[PDB]
From a paper:
Determination of the pKa values by NMR spectroscopy requires relatively high protein concentrations. In particular, it requires the protein samples to be soluble in a low ionic strength buffer. However, wild-type [name] [name] crystallized readily in a low ionic strength buffer (e.g. 10 mM sodium citrate/phosphate buffer at pH 6.5) when the protein concentration was above 0.01 mM. Structural analysis revealed that Arg-8, Arg-21, Arg-42, Arg-54, and Arg-76 are involved in crystal contacts.
Protein stability can be rationally improved by optimizing various types of interactions. One strategy is to optimize charge-charge interactions on the protein surface.
Numbering used by the authors: 1 to 97
Write the structure that this text describes.
Amino acid sequence: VDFAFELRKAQDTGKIVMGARKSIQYAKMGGAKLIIVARNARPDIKEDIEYYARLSGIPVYEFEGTSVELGTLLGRPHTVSALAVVDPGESRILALG
């Protein structure tokens, strides 16, 4: 699965929500279809995300990259340490699950 491509595709054709806060929020509300977390997401933040996702049976795929690398992918001027896919759109981003 072409992560970078599929991520962008889901960005351009679906619904992704960025940030640890929002991802935990969509996890506990079960609104998220998948969560992506940066390899180096801050351990205390990463553990909570990973807990809420598990609580809700939501899949989590660890991006093998940094949060500055994930942020640059999403074309953001800032770090992204986790993201929740609400709508995959036309992409295969759920195949990461």
